[PDB]
């Protein structure tokens, strides 16, 4: 019955600021420390700073000395983090967690919010530009062959790709999007046998909701 509630996502524009919140319940707010932690995908955790809601004590870590500002709200028992001049580099998931009982280090990172995904961009609804991915003159005389589509420069998440609208579904692989200079990019491949291509056309179908768009791209040999 101990619980800290973090709102899931928040999107915010480069150069602006943001104030994260952490709604603690199920325990005596005043007596336990609250810590904040940064997690960029494919990176570990990064300690930002901790606060003791009883009498305004903080320790920050040097690097976030003046990115981050930390505040309590004893009445509503919610904990706050102000982020300053938000840049691309600050797009991370942000966790708050409950620490020790009183001034001491004899406790644990006991309980963790589920985080706020802070995504920093000036992007406006862009369809994807789907380009094909053919091999290659290094000519697999062999069983199978892989071809795919780059789905570049679309925003926001997600798009969804299929191959011949589902006709071909075995051995299809779609990969995670990656954030590339304000815009997302991902890809999908699909592995067929030799005879069946370019014999029979193989197309990927790529749908992007937010732009109400949907394109198909015939994969032609090089």
């Amino acid at each position: 019955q101990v619980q800290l509630q973090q709102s899931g996502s928040e999107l915010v524009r480069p150069g602006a600021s943001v104030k994260l919140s952490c709604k603690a319940s199920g325990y005596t707010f005043t007596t336990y420390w609250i810590h904040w932690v940064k997690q960029r995908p494919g990176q570990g955790l990064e300690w930002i700073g901790t606060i003791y809601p009883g009498s305004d004590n903080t320790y920050y870590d040097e690097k976030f000395k003046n990115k981050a500002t930390l505040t309590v709200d004893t009445s509503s028992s919610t904990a706050f983090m102000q982020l300053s001049s938000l840049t691309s580099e600050d797009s991370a998931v942000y966790f708050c967690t409950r620490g020790s009982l009183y001034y001491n280090n004899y406790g644990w990172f006991g309980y963790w919010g589920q985080g706020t995904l802070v995504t920093v961009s000036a992007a406006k609804t862009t369809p994807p530009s789907v380009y094909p991915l053919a091999p290659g003159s290094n000519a697999a005389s062999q069983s199978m062959v892989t071809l795919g589509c780059l789905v570049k420069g679309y925003f926001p998440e997600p798009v969804t790709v299929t191959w011949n609208s589902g006709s071909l579904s075995s051995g299809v692989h779609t990969f995670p999007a990656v954030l590339q200079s304000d815009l997302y990019t991902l890809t999908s491949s699909v592995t067929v046998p030799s005879s069946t291509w370019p014999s029979q056309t193989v197309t990927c179908n790529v749908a992007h909701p937010a732009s109400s768009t949907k394109v198909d791209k015939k994969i032609v040999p090089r």
Binding site: H35, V37, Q39, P41, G42, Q43, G44, L45, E46, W47, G49, T50, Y59, Y60, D61, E62, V93, F95, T97, N105, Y106, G107, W108, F109, G110, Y111, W112, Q114, G115, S129, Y131, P132, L133, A134, P135, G136, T146, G148, L150, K152, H173, F175, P176, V178, Q180, T185, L186, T187, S189, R222
Partner: protein
Amino acid sequence: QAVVTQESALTTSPGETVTLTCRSSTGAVTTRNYANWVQEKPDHFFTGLIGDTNNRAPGVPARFSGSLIGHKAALTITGAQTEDESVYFCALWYSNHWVFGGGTKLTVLGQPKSSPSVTLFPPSSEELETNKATLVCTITDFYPGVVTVDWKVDGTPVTQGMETTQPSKQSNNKYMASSYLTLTAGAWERHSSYSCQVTHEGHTVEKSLSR
């Protein structure tokens, strides 16, 4: 500004023991670094495991034990179970801040190891026609799901312009990853050797394409 260092990945199988270490750039670890350890399970659920070097947190299984062996903090899991495949971060206190290690992914082997299927792709001309070029490296069907992916252009290494998705599961419970090298239409045409190198279980598999 300490660098806390952990084993990058580690594999066990159920029933076995394993120890994850964590050591300080600052030399030996002291009792007063208060070494914690924290598990991260899928979907960002963290749970504290250890505090004050060897204190086990209420609820946590006796398997998990915390230590200080010579100059480094450790965490030994004794009765290793499939519940324990996870990522473990130790964290140390240095008088006025906490600093986390970069974590160890534990993999509790549940199937024979499979090596990755790398596939390099040259830029489509259509893309080139927008002043930009992107090479794509698709890694699929590997277990455990740990890889490093390095790119080389013209023999030399690249360290800015690449992106690599962290591995994800495939219906068959093996893993897949993708890597994107980006360069302008010019750059593309100024080089020749393009190479994507994927390492897995200390065996590298490489693909390169020449223009």
